[PDB]
Design a protein around this ligand. Structure first.
Ligand SMILES: Nc1ncnc2c1ncn2[C@@H]1O[C@H](COP(=O)(O)OP(=O)(O)OP(=O)(O)O)[C@@H](O)[C@H]1O
Ligand SMILES: Nc1ncnc2c1ncn2[C@@H]1O[C@H](COP(=O)(O)OP(=O)(O)O)[C@@H](O)[C@H]1O
Ligand SMILES: [Mg+2]
Ligand SMILES: [Mg+2]
Lengths: 177, 365, 277, 210, 141, 70, 105, 52, 70, 52
């Protein structure tokens, strides 16, 4: 049931009647969004558009053919037309593929959507590629993390996040192929 | 006793005394002949006594204009009905040699002094440019063999002007309500001939060149015009308090004038942007269309009563008209006519989109 | 006398130098803080591609944020946002609801605590003091989910160009309160997505709308900072041309008073010498 | 007596009465100002002698606007009664449209921003400005001036771009048939019989550009 | 803020229509209000010297002083604008000689030389017409 | 107030006014000290906004009417 | 400057040529005539220049013209005092100038 | 200007000069603190315009 | 430096100074046009901060004590 | 304050024309070839109008 249809078209009339007529109607982030979810397209075969995102940088916006993402239930590959999903991610390696060649960014968390028009959206807070990490620091940081376990369970939640991320990173650096 | 002229900036901020000397200070093209013709139009009709016009060193075109506009007004009657005329013209205009312009104000004063002393009447003495008296004495004193004083004037400036101006008085047996125009020589109020005649006036109405460059007519400076009638013991506290409030708002806007220039209005305080908007309103509300200016503007004249101005200027001060635009106040008579102009500005922004006027089948009409 | 207009000319001349310096300081600050704005523009659109854009919802408790600037030479920006803030705040208030109004930047607290002081619970300043980062926006968003509203209206200036700064309103719905319900049509529009997370969808949507509030708040203050620098770059340009027109007028007035002074002092000398000669 | 020097000279430019032949004398004194300063001694002398003024601005003159008439500061209130009728009909809305055009001066998008609803008065006051430009040594008859400003201010040149209104108004004068100029000069006003044939003549001309 | 003393010369300086005469008048009226209270020798006797003013203003001032009872202690020297320039020049000295009687006989005087900027213009008129060489703003040496 | 001086200062005024007027003379100097810093609205630490009303109340205290000495 | 005008006026009126005349600092011509008229006891006009400033300049600048036999063209270095173009000596000199060549640093 | 700030004696520290202000006369230790006070006062006099 | 002229100029200076001072007056002029930015906290693009520190050490280079010519 | 890269192509075409216009206003003089070697040019008005 959708008898109360909020939206950019349906904010405009209540604004034009209530707000003063000197002002132009305020913009919306939907006006700056060119591609959407429900309206189909964007696949045209074996390609599908991958938008890999961080708050500080836009890591990829090209089209790919498979991406493997570290979900909470383990890794999973997204082919050209996956089922629509909202997959929470755990610390692991996001791997893009455009064909024979691949780029592997290690991520810290985040989510990953793929939409009913086949466009996928990987939304993480910090993604550093495996060249940028040195393995001598993650071993000592996990040693300092898996040692001190305070009884204040906020800090043990932070410790669990630490040992999860550092352990998946350590397994992510001997996993060269 | 007050003399209501029907001009908003004159009634509110510097009201005219009914038997006192009145000066209109102006700077060559700011409007002190149009203001004095409007004072003749508004005052000399409702006055029951006699009028004298001393034209001292002004245009002869204006002398013929005043003569013809007084004949068609019936104020001057020619021939057999001459006894019913109410006005005496004395003309020493700017084509005359300087000995004539330096003594024609004394002729106009003598005609007014007869009606004051002998006839016991109330007289109006309009002098167009009492400055040209001073200037004509300055022209003839260069050849009288005197050492000149400051800017180039005669050493006897103040005693000449004082011996002329001390004769224009309300005595115990008659009153002369004299309105004099004073010309400031290079828009200079510190020139010795305006600065000397500031002292002999009860009400000075100083007209400004920059106010006229804004388009606000009459171009009366509200913070340079003064009166001895602006006093609560003569006009009452309700008029005095709204006059001093309007002057306070206009000065508090003048103190912001360079910050608004070099920074813009974007950064001012919201208790001062209110002050700037209210003062931009009450300095358009001092603008007024004249009955004598309707021939070269086309907008008809507006006589505003005094109580209308006091109530209309209380309303902009308290905030009862903060929603009306600034230009709704420009060149209207009353605060009522602001309201019929504010909404007429909002029809005409909506009447753009109503019709597509085409004219058919008139080639056979 | 003729010394006051000389030092006034000097004052206006140095003010013109100061504002011409501040103009290109704001030009450099806009040129470097533009790439960060375009980089942060990417992450806001997967959520509006997923959750959509629902400004005209009926909520009972709502937090409205006006993202303003800190320094006060922006030239018509923070006043524009406090216009649009109450212009959309009166548009969506007709239900007898609760509203918390928050400002980012203390020029918002100087402008919002006099226009809605009944509803003003939070003032957040010093945000641009070094740079805006995502953890900072995350802490601000956690202070916003300290209250438990049903919606979040975010008011900011989108950096459209170096001259145009479109003021936008971005809306975030609370998960269990309106997010599942404003997607209901013929069932639900979110049921096409297969949730691959740990717990149930009432926590996935909680994490997603907290993330979405933080992301649009990061992009809000980042876009608003770039438009604040770009409008200061134009306001200081108008200030230099105004203090140049004022200098060009006041120099002519000084030259007139200079010539008048030399003439009147020489006329005083000649008048004093002709009385003796 | 440098005031009297000019006053006794300019007062001789009179319009005599009907007993004195009815002759007249028009004067155009010329006063050169220094840096646009009209608060000079001699300039304020002659301003307070002559009836109107024709202020010519150096800013407009070095912007190509020639004759560079400052339309706000220039007045002539004595010859306003003695205007050509028909020109008086259209010159009212001419200087009112230019009057509200002068309210869009230096803040179209120069000053702070743009509202862009007064683009109509902006791109109308520009066409009224370049309508009034005129080259040297070629004075226009009054019946061809009032037709040109009728074509300007009734909206008959509203579609033309700003760059060729100089060509548009001379095309209006050369293409509209020269009977209407004789009707307008002999009648001396835009009669109700004449605005119809004028508006019928003004739609059937090819204005350049666009 | 600027307290006067009993033998002090305090200048009231300002532009026109700012209230200089008003400050002087409130001084004279307040001295009437305090003269009816002090034992016979702290009483201040006022002198108003009205140089260059118009005769109507002096009539208004005499009317005000006599309706407030301050004319019992006040002398008014009035060399108005129509008077000859030596009378306007000499009226501060006439008024000071009138008010020096109270200073010399153990009483206390107070004098207001209203428009002392006009005594100098009358002196300049006299000295330029006696053909003495002018100076700054054609004032005498 | 800044431009009007007096040579005698004290020793020639009311002693009771001398107790209560030095704290007015210096406080109006503090009030004039902040008038060139009231065009922006930063309102530093409830000092440059507190005397901005305290001195403004003192200058309103010093106003009075005409022909009515106290 | 009148000596230079005479040597140019020979080449104009007799030889029938197109002559240049370089008056180096027409301002110093004006200034020298101001000094001369101050020494003859004359009352200075506006700011301190000679009363005959316009006619002393016009005595020079009106012999520089094109006649039926030749012409004299004149490139005059102009000094502007106190950076003031409305100073009456450059304001008078600019009334006679038919062109302007500004050399910039 | 110094006296309008209530600072008495209202000596302009910059515009005052002496022949004794020489490091050979009053000593270099006195001279350098005098020149340093004048340096910081001239720098503040130049900074007041951008402060306002 | 900007208002001091010598119309003889470089034709009558030290030829070893003439090839060093021609840089000096040029970068002093560059420092004089960028003179407001010295009082700023926001550093600019380091083609102006370079000339700012350079012109500052050059003005401190030309200082000289009295009665000790070089 | 911004840079030549953000300019329009017609706001770089005026730069590319104006730089060679102000280079084409230069001229080697005949009175400087005594000590600068490059011979001097006398340009006619007809060459100047067409070349600009
Ligand atoms: N304390 C006051 N409160 C209100 N109004 C005042 C006060 N003092 C003076 N005025 C008004 O100011 C006007 C000018 O006052 P006053 O004549 O004393 O000034 P003035 O400088 O002597 O003027 P002038 O130079 O014309 O003689 C008077 O009309 C008076 O009513
Ligand atoms: N009240 C007014 N309304 C409209 N225009 C005015 C008004 N007063 C003056 N003007 C304009 O200013 C000019 C000044 O005319 P006038 O009064 O003769 O000047 P002066 O002050 O030199 O006597 C008039 O031509 C008129 O166009
Ligand atoms: Mg007149
Ligand atoms: Mg007085």
């Amino acid at each position: 049931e959708a008898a109360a249809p909020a939206g950019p078209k349906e904010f405009t009339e209540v604004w034009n009647k209530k707000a003063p007529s000197t002002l132009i109607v305020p913009e919306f982030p939907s006006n700056y969004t060119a591609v959407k979810a429900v309206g189909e397209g964007q696949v045209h075969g074996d390609a599908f558009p991958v938008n890999f995102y961080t708050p500080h940088s836009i890591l990829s916006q090209a089209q790919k053919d498979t991406v493997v993402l570290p979900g909470v239930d383990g890794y999973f590959g997204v082919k050209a037309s996956h089922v629509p999903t909202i997959a929470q991610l755990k610390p692991g390696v996001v791997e893009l593929h455009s064909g024979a060649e691949s780029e592997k960014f290690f991520v810290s968390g985040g989510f990953a959507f793929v939409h009913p028009n086949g466009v996928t959206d990987i939304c993480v807070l910090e993604a550093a590629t495996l060249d940028q990490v040195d393995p001598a620091a993650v071993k000592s940081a996990l040693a300092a993390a898996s040692a001190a376990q305070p009884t204040d369970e906020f800090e043990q939640a932070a410790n669990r996040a630490a040992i999860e991320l550092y352990s998946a990173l350590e397994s992510a650096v001997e996993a060269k192929a | 006793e007050i003399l209501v002229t029907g001009i908003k900036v004159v009634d509110l901020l510097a009201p005219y005394q009914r038997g006192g000397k009145i000066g209109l200070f102006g700077g060559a093209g700011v409007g002190k002949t149009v203001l004095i013709m409007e004072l003749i139009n508004n005052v000399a009709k409702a006055h029951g006594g006699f009028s004298v016009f001393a034209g001292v060193g002004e245009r002869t075109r204006e002398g013929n204009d005043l003569y013809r506009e007084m004949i068609e007004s019936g104020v001057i009657k020619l021939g057999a009905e001459r006894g019913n005329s109410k006005c005496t013209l004395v003309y020493g205009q700017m084509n005359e040699p300087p000995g004539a312009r330096a003594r024609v104000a004394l002729t106009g004063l003598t005609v007014a002094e007869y009606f004051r002393d002998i006839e016991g009447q109330d007289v109006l003495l309009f002098v167009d440019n009492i400055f040209r008296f001073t200037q004509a004495n300055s022209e003839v004193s260069a050849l009288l063999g005197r050492i000149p004083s400051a800017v180039g004037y005669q050493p006897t400036l103040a005693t000449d002007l004082g011996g002329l101006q001390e004769r224009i008085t309300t005595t115990t047996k008659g009153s002369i309500t004299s309105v004099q125009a004073v010309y400031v020589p290079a828009d200079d109020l510190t020139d010795p001939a305006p600065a000397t005649t500031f002292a002999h006036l009860d009400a000075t109405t100083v007209l400004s060149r920059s106010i006229a460059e804004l388009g606000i007519y009459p171009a009366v400076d509200p913070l340079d015009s003064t009166s001895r009638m602006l006093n609560p013991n003569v006009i009452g506290a309700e008029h005095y308090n709204v006059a001093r409030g309007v002057q306070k708002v206009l000065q508090d806007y003048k103190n912001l004038q360079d910050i608004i220039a070099i920074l813009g209005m974007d950064e001012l305080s919201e208790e001062d942007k209110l002050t700037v908007a209210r003062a931009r309103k009450i300095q358009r509300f001092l603008s007024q269309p004249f009955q004598v200016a309707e021939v070269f503007t086309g907008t008809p004249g507006k006589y505003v009563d005094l109580a209308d101005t006091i109530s209309g200027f209380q309303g902009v001060l308290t905030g009862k008209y903060d929603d009306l635009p600034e230009m709704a106040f420009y060149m209207v008579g009353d605060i009522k006519e602001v309201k019929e102009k504010a909404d007429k500005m909002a029809k005409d922004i909506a009447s753009r989109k109503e019709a597509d006027n085409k004219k058919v089948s008139e080639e056979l009409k | 006398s003729n010394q006051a207009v000389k030092q006034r000319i000097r004052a206006i001349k140095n003010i013109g130098k100061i504002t011409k310096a501040m103009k290109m300081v704001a030009a450099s600050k806009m040129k470097n803080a533009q790439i960060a704005v375009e980089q942060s523009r990417g992450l806001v659109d997967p959520f509006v591609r997923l959750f959509g854009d629902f400004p005209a919802v009926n909520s009972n408790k709502s937090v409205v944020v006006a993202v303003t600037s800190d320094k006060g030479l922006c030239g018509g920006l923070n006043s524009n946002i406090t216009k649009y803030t109450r212009a959309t705040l009166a548009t969506t208030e007709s239900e007898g609801k609760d509203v918390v109004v928050v400002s980012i930047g203390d020029k918002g607290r100087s402008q919002l605590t006099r226009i809605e002081s009944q509803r003003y619970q939070l003032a957040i300043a010093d945000t641009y003091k070094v740079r805006v980062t995502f953890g900072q926006a995350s802490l601000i968003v956690e202070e916003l989910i300290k209250h438990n509203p049903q919606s979040y209206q975010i008011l900011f200036n989108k950096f459209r160009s170096a001259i145009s700064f479109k003021p936008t309103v971005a809306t975030i719905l609370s998960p269990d309160l309106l997010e599942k319900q404003l997607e209901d049509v013929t069932g639900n529009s979110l049921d096409a997505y297969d949730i691959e997370a740990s717990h149930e969808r009432s926590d996935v949507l909680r994490d997603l709308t907290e993330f979405h509030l933080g992301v649009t708040l990061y992009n809000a203050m980042l876009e608003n900072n770039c438009s604040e620098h770009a409008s200061r770059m134009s306001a200081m340009e108008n200030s230099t041309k105004s203090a140049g027109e004022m200098l060009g007028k006041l120099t002519l007035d000084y030259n007139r008073k200079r010539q008048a002074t030399i003439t009147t002092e020489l006329i005083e000398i000649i008048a004093g010498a002709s009385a003796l000669m | 007596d440098v005031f009297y020097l000019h006053s006794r000279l300019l007062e001789r430019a009179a319009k005599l009465s009907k007993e004195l032949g009815g002759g007249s004398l028009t004067a155009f004194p010329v006063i050169e100002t220094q840096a646009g300063d009209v608060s000079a001694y001699i300039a304020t002398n002659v301003i307070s002698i002559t009836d109107g003024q024709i202020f010519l601005e150096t800013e407009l003159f070095y912007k190509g606007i020639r004759p560079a008439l400052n339309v706000g500061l220039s007045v002539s209130r004595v010859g306003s009664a003695a205007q050509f009728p028909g020109m008086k009909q259209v010159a009212g809305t001419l200087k009112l449209e230019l009057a509200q055009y002068r309210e869009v001066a230096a803040f179209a998008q120069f000053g702070s921003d743009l509202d862009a609803a007064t683009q109509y008065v902006l791109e109308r006051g520009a066409r009224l400005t370049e309508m009034l430009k005129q080259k040297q040594f070629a004075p226009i008859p009054i019946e061809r001036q009032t037709v040109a400003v009728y074509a300007a201010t009734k909206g008959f040149l509203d579609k033309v771009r700003v760059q060729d209104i100089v060509a548009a108004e001379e095309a209006v004068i050369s293409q509209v048939n020269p009977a209407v100029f004789k009707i307008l000069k002999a009648n001396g006003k835009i009669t109700p019989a004449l605005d119809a044939h004028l508006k019928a003549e003004l739609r059937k001309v090819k204005l350049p550009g666009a | 803020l600027v307290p006067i003393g009993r033998g002090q010369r305090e200048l009231i300086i300002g532009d026109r229509q700012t209230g200089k005469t008003a400050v002087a008048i409130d001084a004279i009226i307040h001295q009437k209000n305090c003269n009816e209270q002090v034992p016979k020798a702290q009483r201040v006797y006022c002198v108003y010297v009205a140089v260059g003013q118009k005769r109507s203003t002096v009539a208004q001032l005499v009317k005000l002083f006599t309706q407030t009872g301050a004319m019992r202690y006040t002398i008014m020297v009035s060399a108005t604008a129509s008077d000859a320039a030596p009378l306007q020049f000499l009226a501060p000295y006439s008024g000071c000689a009138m008010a020096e009687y109270f200073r010399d006989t153990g009483k206390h005087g107070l004098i207001i030389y209203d428009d002392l900027s006009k005594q100098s213009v009358a002196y300049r008129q006299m000295s330029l017409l006696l053909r003495r060489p002018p100076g700054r703003e054609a004032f005498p040496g």
